[PDB]
Amino acid sequence: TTALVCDNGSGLVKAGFAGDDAPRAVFPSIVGRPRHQGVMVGMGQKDSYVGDEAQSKRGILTLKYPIEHGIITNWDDMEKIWHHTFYNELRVAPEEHPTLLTEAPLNPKANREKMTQIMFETFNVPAMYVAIQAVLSLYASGRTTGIVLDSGDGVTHNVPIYEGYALPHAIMRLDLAGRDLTDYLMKILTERGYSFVTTAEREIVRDIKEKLCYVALDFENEMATAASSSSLEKSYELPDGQVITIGNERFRCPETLFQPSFIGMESAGIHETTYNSIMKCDIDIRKDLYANNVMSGGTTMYPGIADRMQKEITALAPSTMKIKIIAPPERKYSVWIGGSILASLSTFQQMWITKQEYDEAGPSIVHRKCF
Amino acid sequence: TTALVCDNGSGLVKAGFAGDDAPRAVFPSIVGRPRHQGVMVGMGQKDSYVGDEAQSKRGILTLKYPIEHGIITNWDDMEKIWHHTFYNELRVAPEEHPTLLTEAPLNPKANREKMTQIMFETFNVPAMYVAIQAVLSLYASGRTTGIVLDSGDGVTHNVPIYEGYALPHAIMRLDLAGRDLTDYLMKILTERGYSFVTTAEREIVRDIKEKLCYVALDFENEMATAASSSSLEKSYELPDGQVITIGNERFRCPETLFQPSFIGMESAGIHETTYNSIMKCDIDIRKDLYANNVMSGGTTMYPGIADRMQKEITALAPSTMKIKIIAPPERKYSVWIGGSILASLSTFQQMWITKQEYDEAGPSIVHRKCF
Amino acid sequence: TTALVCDNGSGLVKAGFAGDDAPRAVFPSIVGRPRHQGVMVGMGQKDSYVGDEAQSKRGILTLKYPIEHGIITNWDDMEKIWHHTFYNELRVAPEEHPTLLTEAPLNPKANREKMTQIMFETFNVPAMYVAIQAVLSLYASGRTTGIVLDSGDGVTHNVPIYEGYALPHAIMRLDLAGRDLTDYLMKILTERGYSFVTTAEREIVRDIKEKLCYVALDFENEMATAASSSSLEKSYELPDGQVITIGNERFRCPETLFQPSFIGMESAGIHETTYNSIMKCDIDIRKDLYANNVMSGGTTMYPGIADRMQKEITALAPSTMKIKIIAPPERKYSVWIGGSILASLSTFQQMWITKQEYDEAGPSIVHRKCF
Amino acid sequence: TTALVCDNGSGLVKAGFAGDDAPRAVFPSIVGRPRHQGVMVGMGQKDSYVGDEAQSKRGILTLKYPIEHGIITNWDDMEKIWHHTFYNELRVAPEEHPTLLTEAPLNPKANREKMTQIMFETFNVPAMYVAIQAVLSLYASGRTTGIVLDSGDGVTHNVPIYEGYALPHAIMRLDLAGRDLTDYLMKILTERGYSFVTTAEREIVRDIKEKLCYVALDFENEMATAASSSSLEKSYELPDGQVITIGNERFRCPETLFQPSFIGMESAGIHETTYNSIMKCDIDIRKDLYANNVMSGGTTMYPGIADRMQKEITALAPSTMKIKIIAPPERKYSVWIGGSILASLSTFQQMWITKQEYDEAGPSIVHRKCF
Amino acid sequence: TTALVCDNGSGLVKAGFAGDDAPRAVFPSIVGRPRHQGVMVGMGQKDSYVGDEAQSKRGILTLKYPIEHGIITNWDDMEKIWHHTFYNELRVAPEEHPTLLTEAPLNPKANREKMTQIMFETFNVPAMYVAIQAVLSLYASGRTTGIVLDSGDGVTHNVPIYEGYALPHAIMRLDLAGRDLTDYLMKILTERGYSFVTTAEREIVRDIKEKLCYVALDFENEMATAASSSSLEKSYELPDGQVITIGNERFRCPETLFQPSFIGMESAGIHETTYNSIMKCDIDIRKDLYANNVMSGGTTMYPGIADRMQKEITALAPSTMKIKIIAPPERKYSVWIGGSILASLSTFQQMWITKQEYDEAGPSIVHRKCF
Ligand SMILES: C/C1=C\CC[C@H](C)OC(=O)C[C@H](c2ccc(O)cc2)NC(=O)[C@@H](Cc2c[nH]c3ccccc23)N(C)C(=O)[C@H](CCCCN)NC(=O)[C@@H](C)C1
Ligand SMILES: Nc1ncnc2c1ncn2[C@@H]1O[C@H](COP(=O)(O)OP(=O)(O)O)[C@@H](O)[C@H]1O
Ligand SMILES: Nc1ncnc2c1ncn2[C@@H]1O[C@H](COP(=O)(O)OP(=O)(O)O)[C@@H](O)[C@H]1O
Ligand SMILES: Nc1ncnc2c1ncn2[C@@H]1O[C@H](COP(=O)(O)OP(=O)(O)O)[C@@H](O)[C@H]1O
Ligand SMILES: Nc1ncnc2c1ncn2[C@@H]1O[C@H](COP(=O)(O)OP(=O)(O)O)[C@@H](O)[C@H]1O
Ligand SMILES: Nc1ncnc2c1ncn2[C@@H]1O[C@H](COP(=O)(O)OP(=O)(O)O)[C@@H](O)[C@H]1O
Ligand SMILES: [Mg+2]
Ligand SMILES: [Mg+2]
Ligand SMILES: [Mg+2]
Ligand SMILES: [Mg+2]
Ligand SMILES: [Mg+2]
């Protein structure tokens, strides 16, 4: 019975049932359309490949995301993905379960609103709830206090929570995220002749990133050692068997998370952003935040990113403050896990917005909150 | 068995049992409410943190006092504190013990009245009595004659007693007290960039005051020496590890007790106030008052305040009169101790106002007196 | 001949000559540095655009203020601005005129001190004087009695003056100011998809604010009417021709001046702050303060802010007290005008601190006062 | 009932009925006219021998093709051949069946156009369709993905198809084909005195080619071994009983398919052409193309041509890519078979262009496509 | 004296002296080798025809470019061309002049690097500098602000510059260029029987393109009018006197610059690419970019391409933004002219990289920049 938990992210979709210890359906939020000789109808063929299908057929498809920086732009393709989950991956009659959805804070109200509408009308959902991803991530850690740094492909955001009592006043959001890192790699790999321009090629670059990139603890001295050939130089085999050799880029791309100016992102680096949000809060809180820096999301899966982070924050902070980062394994699922927790939680059941309530109240109901 | 003694002050609450040599429960009279995103209900959470709880969670709470200058303004929060004592700190069934309460002289009758009502009705107290704090302080000293200068956060007051036979005609009261000293520090620390504005921040300033402030024996020459860096300059570490450096303020704040004009308090300084109350009394008494100046209360815990006081009074008085100040250690508990004494005293048992008596007589009974 | 008057505010700089009926040089206190490909030297180019220059080139510059909440933090950029005025906007040999400077009360002494030093040493100023902005504002109104509420970008402050004889004891200062209003708009506009994050974008938001925001006389009922589309919904054209539509935000942002809790500013609203400062003063004064509430500063240029203010204070005050607000046109220049007045005033000439005096006395001289 | 399938190639004509497992009529696309003493009329005699007739009477006829490199040049002779099929070889009333025709890609539009016209007007065809030969060949193999290399007498061409979704963007065409191989033999046999110059003689050379030529796996070392007499030296008996002995030419002629420069064909060899078309496609596709190289057409009937091909492509490709060639028996009929398949296919019936449609629309209709 | 300016493009080479108002040597970057009977040695003959020589002898040569999409692939042939310029076309002792070279942005570092090496070692160049072509083009226009769209045979690229201060963050590059247009013509002319396959034939097609192709302002309606014979149908005489008639192709080929999907180029059209780069930049800049769209390069020499461009961008942009294209005559030389300007510029002389510096520093020096 129970409910569904759906991490409808900007990168990919993680869906499963509340109470599960992991998602059952994990696939990319991509819809692919035929590039050459536009479509054939009565043969079936197909012109809308989704997720792993799009991956399989990738070479001849135009890969589009529906989501841009946390915003659902292409609601039609979004709908297709929802359908694909419910009927192809989980294969369960939507209307039999409540649906827990998640989102990044500070989204345009229209996203929460219209998305809700669709769930109720198109999919006949019985009840649903929308939660902030960072909050859920904290639940997964089991801490009641800390800063949650959650970062994916569309956005990066920071939420500070103190023994419950989340502090809305200091929530921050950056457009700097995984897709920018990927784009930077396209630009940087160009230095060595490795031109990538199509959406299929973008995907390949992503694969590279996720396997070879790492965070240097000292980018300047990393670059210094990079003057000599070493373990930095690492091969990668393409889909067609050709081999790529990557050097400085292994960490120069991750560097942009601390040196955002590289891509024209005139803003603070992550470590600065974090530090600043601490400064924005009451001095009596700061201490506990320093010792409870929760990190989650796929873009925190770079080797040594936590260590680099700790180092940098320690430098910014007063020497007497203990800087400690909470960054368990399975950070990719942190949000989903948090969702499973709350959905299984007894108290939480009062939160469900039923379709009945929606119909009686209307759209605005999605912004309510109480526990 | 016996009774309870409760120093329900303006700063904090000191409670224990009659006959104890010290309070068992000592905590600040503060109720804290959530600043950000107003409260959550069914999770419990809590929206009313009291005393040390308020301290622990201070950063996200609005700290309010129920008492202003000795007057109970917020009876609801007052009630909460009473509850907290009885059930969380002492953890004793109120109705099993008589309760000795204390107050500053010249309060509005409604305080004594309504407070009494609550004790009898809400807490089902069996018997109670309200005493003047200064009087109790004298009992703690064990003297039968002297002037009691008792000063806390809300008020400062002077009572002169001569071999018993307290002299109501010359009781004096000032609004100048600990909270004004704290406020002055906020204003003075601003000179060095140390801005404090929230109630949490107020609390921090208090902590500073109580550790670093002292009374100069000669403020003018203290300021003279302050021209050069010295031991006057003293560091202080904040909750978040940042360090504050304080100089002149170490004593400039305490100076306001002798130079009240600094804060617009158009009145006499403490030493003058004392001297004047002596002048207000019969010349045959004056002598003994000069040699028995009892000092108590938390705002007399500044280093050298007694010595400064003695000096100043000596200057005002005739040279042949021996000026002697009685200022033992544990001045913070003087009143409470006095309460313990009388509550244990055999004779005193006749003073108890029983709920029965109250019910038979009514409110006005709280103003009776005889020994 | 005569002297110069310089309103070196937190927002912008208004400079002119004493005796002028208006500033000759009005431009923002901003220094802009090249974002992309850090600078070119021998071509000149320029890497320090100031004021209107920074505005013109805004898109590719990092806009920084030197002043934060009334405090000069970046003295180098501050110096650049001073230079720009004297040599580019007024184009007058600094050393030929005395300089009247202004500041918010309760600043760290180091500001007045170091600023003075620079004027004398770097710019070879002959004589100078520093005055409190609120005081000057009163002079512009021509009243001898009233409360001056002056509010800009960095700070908001309240000074009460009674027939001269300014009352230092009740001067109040808030960090809540124009920059917070702007930041709140960034956060609130996000609700509609209008993301602004760069310093260039901040500037755009400011422009919006200053043209479309207004104060509702009843925010609750304003929000009620806001349920329906109306004149509340107002278009705005961006620099690139795109059009923005703004609704509730038109007044929800101004609301924070009365409901500071919206941004976590745990303090009183303006109307409360004012009322409280009146309560802090002697009851014989209060009457005249009620009938003489002087309002000035750029953040008082919201439509209906005076009317809203009057309403709220009237509610707080006793019904028999006549609440009257003094809020002429040209409130933006009130301080500067006051400066012109005093600088032209005969009596006032004795106030000038000459460089000679400074050299003979030293820094501390800047805190003298007598008329 | 059903329809007809006609492989009207550049070499010969293969006709049969849809659903047949083989053509019923297979004969060369040749029209022969009397060389000596131009024709006799009223005796009948005949001056237009077609196909096998032309073969039988070959010695005294001028053999002409109507098709040159896939283009129909002599429409009159073309018409004669169509007639011969329908009335002499299949012997079926044209108008009773739909006709599936085939062609090489990138033909001049006029071929498809005018040919269509003739079918409808001269032969009163009810419905027809024109398909690309390579595509049909793939259908015969039954694969959904692969590269089809189809090569006959007039042209050689390459089409890459990926799970349907044929990729028009990388279709390639070469003039290098069977007729060039034949011409090269005429030139090479001349080295040994074997002069062939007439069209009858050309035909003989073709016969030789098709029986004795083979592809060496290593032409250089084949030539090395050719220094000694061996099995390379092979006899051939002419129509008049004379015997020809052929040596190096057995494989030197086939070599031109990999070494086209031999005949001045300044272009890539077949293996290079294939490889390049793979390079022209998306890297995500390349893999499957490598493992699915479909080969068809009469000029792929040389012994060992597949093995030689595989070898060469393997050399060009990355070592990790599995190079596999699909080259079943009956490659000569692959296209025809594919035609039979689609014509029998249910879905495909919608493709038929009826004469009615043609009359209502006009010529341009022949370029439509949808499934 | 002075220096040399060399537009070593992907199409052709334009060389002259700094300060000249035009190139002195203009010829194609082609090396031709004998197709038939590979070479004769001691007779001289020649096997390496360059530029106009290759043109003259074209029929019997294999024409190869050294450059592919901006990348130097055949360094040997590249060297030959350099030689040909210096000793046959300009006929000047290389080592006597500094050499200004140009390139497309985002090239592999190895190009700049190795090319530099050769200049210094093989040709003993005294000093040299490498500049971005688009930047130079802007200098030729004389504007300080604008977008430079520069497009040749190998690449198309976009650089946006704002009052100097070039914006590296938004530089874009497309593989879509002149050679693709030529290839498309080969494919499209095939529709009418006009088969072109050799490198000599490629060259002929180029000649056609450059004389007859034009950009339609409305391709759909152009195609509509193309249904009737008109001025669209235009004759062309080949080298051997045969005449070609071209119709739709006159503009269908140019259409691919706006409809890149025609050749499988899954990317934005030029007008979209431009528009998008504007969107990528700060909103305060956008305005000036809209009104200053600089266009240069040989592939912008199609009739009406500017007008078509303007139309399309205007459609994409907001109606209030003035869209203006800067497209003077002599766009083919824009880059070269810019080079002449800077080389003659006094300030610029500091930019020269001397061989001495190179020897002392090494390869990496070529990536320095400052003015
Ligand atoms: C352009 C502009 C206003 C135009 C908005 C357009 C007219 O209306 C839209 O719809 C915009 C559309 C929209 C979508 C859906 C909807 O239901 C409602 C709005 N969100 C966006 O465009 C946002 C996109 C965005 C990125 N992170 C965000 C975070 C929150 C909100 C939006 C964004 N967005 C225009 C910008 O970010 C860009 C980039 C600025 C930050 C640098 N990366 N810059 C601006 O916005 C400023 C300049 C003003
Ligand atoms: N091993 C990895 N190393 C670094 N980054 C990764 C790794 N795996 C994933 N990522 C980044 O995280 C992105 C998605 O993670 P996620 O946070 O789940 O996105 P979203 O939450 O929007 O679905 C990936 O697409 C990639 O950009
Ligand atoms: N070490 C100290 N030095 C100076 N002042 C102190 C010290 N400790 C406490 N105080 C002052 O005394 C105040 C409270 O003392 P107390 O007289 O008990 O208040 P109350 O009697 O109203 O409860 C403190 O809050 C502070 O203002
Ligand atoms: N028309 C307006 N409406 C509302 N607020 C305004 C208006 N014009 C200016 N402001 C606010 O006043 C600010 C600056 O005014 P000012 O008081 O002069 O600042 P400062 O005194 O620090 O220079 C502006 O930057 C803006 O925040
Ligand atoms: N046994 C063979 N070996 C080699 N080549 C052959 C053989 N048989 C036929 N061919 C070549 O194939 C040519 C025709 O095959 P085909 O592809 O059917 O031509 P088309 O498809 O144009 O009708 C023959 O005429 C000959 O050139
Ligand atoms: N009249 C013309 N019309 C259209 N395109 C032309 C014309 N002349 C040249 N081109 C195109 O421009 C190409 C080369 O111009 P150019 O930009 O100088 O190349 P590159 O800069 O790489 O040397 C030509 O080879 C051709 O593709
Ligand atoms: Mg996520
Ligand atoms: Mg006390
Ligand atoms: Mg001001
Ligand atoms: Mg065939
Ligand atoms: Mg060029």
PDB file of C-alpha atoms and ligand atoms in Angstrom, chain E residues 7-14 133 150-155 178-179 181-182 206 209-211 213 296-303 332, ligand 6:
ATOM      1  CA  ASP E   7      45.457  36.022 -42.843  1.00  0.00           C
ATOM      2  CA  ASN E   8      46.223  32.349 -42.910  1.00  0.00           C
ATOM      3  CA  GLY E   9      42.629  31.242 -43.154  1.00  0.00           C
ATOM      4  CA  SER E  10      40.975  27.909 -43.865  1.00  0.00           C
ATOM      5  CA  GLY E  11      39.934  28.939 -47.335  1.00  0.00           C
ATOM      6  CA  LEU E  12      42.770  31.088 -48.519  1.00  0.00           C
ATOM      7  CA  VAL E  13      45.736  33.217 -47.614  1.00  0.00           C
ATOM      8  CA  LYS E  14      45.806  36.985 -47.615  1.00  0.00           C
ATOM      9  CA  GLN E 133      40.239  37.026 -36.160  1.00  0.00           C
ATOM     10  CA  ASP E 150      33.044  35.978 -38.735  1.00  0.00           C
ATOM     11  CA  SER E 151      32.653  33.048 -41.022  1.00  0.00           C
ATOM     12  CA  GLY E 152      34.898  31.350 -43.550  1.00  0.00           C
ATOM     13  CA  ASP E 153      35.350  27.866 -44.978  1.00  0.00           C
ATOM     14  CA  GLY E 154      36.449  25.897 -41.950  1.00  0.00           C
ATOM     15  CA  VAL E 155      34.601  27.665 -39.142  1.00  0.00           C
ATOM     16  CA  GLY E 178      31.737  27.460 -46.310  1.00  0.00           C
ATOM     17  CA  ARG E 179      32.956  23.936 -47.007  1.00  0.00           C
ATOM     18  CA  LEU E 181      27.817  24.887 -48.091  1.00  0.00           C
ATOM     19  CA  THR E 182      29.936  23.659 -50.976  1.00  0.00           C
ATOM     20  CA  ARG E 206      32.812  26.701 -55.175  1.00  0.00           C
ATOM     21  CA  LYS E 209      28.438  29.209 -55.342  1.00  0.00           C
ATOM     22  CA  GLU E 210      30.344  32.432 -55.097  1.00  0.00           C
ATOM     23  CA  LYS E 211      28.721  33.830 -58.218  1.00  0.00           C
ATOM     24  CA  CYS E 213      24.063  31.869 -54.684  1.00  0.00           C
ATOM     25  CA  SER E 296      32.534  39.702 -41.752  1.00  0.00           C
ATOM     26  CA  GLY E 297      34.095  36.845 -43.656  1.00  0.00           C
ATOM     27  CA  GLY E 298      33.595  35.436 -47.126  1.00  0.00           C
ATOM     28  CA  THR E 299      30.494  33.482 -46.292  1.00  0.00           C
ATOM     29  CA  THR E 300      28.742  36.714 -45.488  1.00  0.00           C
ATOM     30  CA  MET E 301      29.151  37.790 -49.088  1.00  0.00           C
ATOM     31  CA  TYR E 302      25.837  36.306 -50.128  1.00  0.00           C
ATOM     32  CA  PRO E 303      23.359  38.840 -51.482  1.00  0.00           C
ATOM     33  CA  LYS E 332      36.554  39.523 -47.020  1.00  0.00           C
TER      34      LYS E 332
HETATM   35  N1  LIG F   6      30.985  35.946 -53.506  1.00  0.00           N
HETATM   36  C1  LIG F   6      30.888  35.064 -52.518  1.00  0.00           C
HETATM   37  N2  LIG F   6      29.702  34.710 -52.125  1.00  0.00           N
HETATM   38  C2  LIG F   6      29.539  33.844 -51.180  1.00  0.00           C
HETATM   39  N3  LIG F   6      30.500  33.242 -50.534  1.00  0.00           N
HETATM   40  C3  LIG F   6      31.735  33.507 -50.828  1.00  0.00           C
HETATM   41  C4  LIG F   6      32.018  34.464 -51.862  1.00  0.00           C
HETATM   42  N4  LIG F   6      33.322  34.546 -51.958  1.00  0.00           N
HETATM   43  C5  LIG F   6      33.820  33.693 -51.041  1.00  0.00           C
HETATM   44  N5  LIG F   6      32.865  33.083 -50.381  1.00  0.00           N
HETATM   45  C6  LIG F   6      33.055  32.096 -49.335  1.00  0.00           C
HETATM   46  O1  LIG F   6      34.054  32.539 -48.431  1.00  0.00           O
HETATM   47  C7  LIG F   6      35.063  31.589 -48.412  1.00  0.00           C
HETATM   48  C8  LIG F   6      36.397  32.097 -47.952  1.00  0.00           C
HETATM   49  O2  LIG F   6      36.316  33.346 -47.322  1.00  0.00           O
HETATM   50  P1  LIG F   6      37.233  33.556 -46.071  1.00  0.00           P
HETATM   51  O3  LIG F   6      36.329  33.986 -44.944  1.00  0.00           O
HETATM   52  O4  LIG F   6      38.318  34.497 -46.406  1.00  0.00           O
HETATM   53  O5  LIG F   6      37.880  32.227 -45.753  1.00  0.00           O
HETATM   54  P2  LIG F   6      39.032  32.220 -44.779  1.00  0.00           P
HETATM   55  O6  LIG F   6      38.723  33.458 -43.885  1.00  0.00           O
HETATM   56  O7  LIG F   6      39.024  30.892 -44.051  1.00  0.00           O
HETATM   57  O8  LIG F   6      40.228  32.426 -45.640  1.00  0.00           O
HETATM   58  C9  LIG F   6      35.070  31.262 -49.842  1.00  0.00           C
HETATM   59  O9  LIG F   6      35.982  30.235 -50.141  1.00  0.00           O
HETATM   60  C10 LIG F   6      33.645  30.914 -50.012  1.00  0.00           C
HETATM   61  O10 LIG F   6      33.263  29.702 -49.341  1.00  0.00           O
END
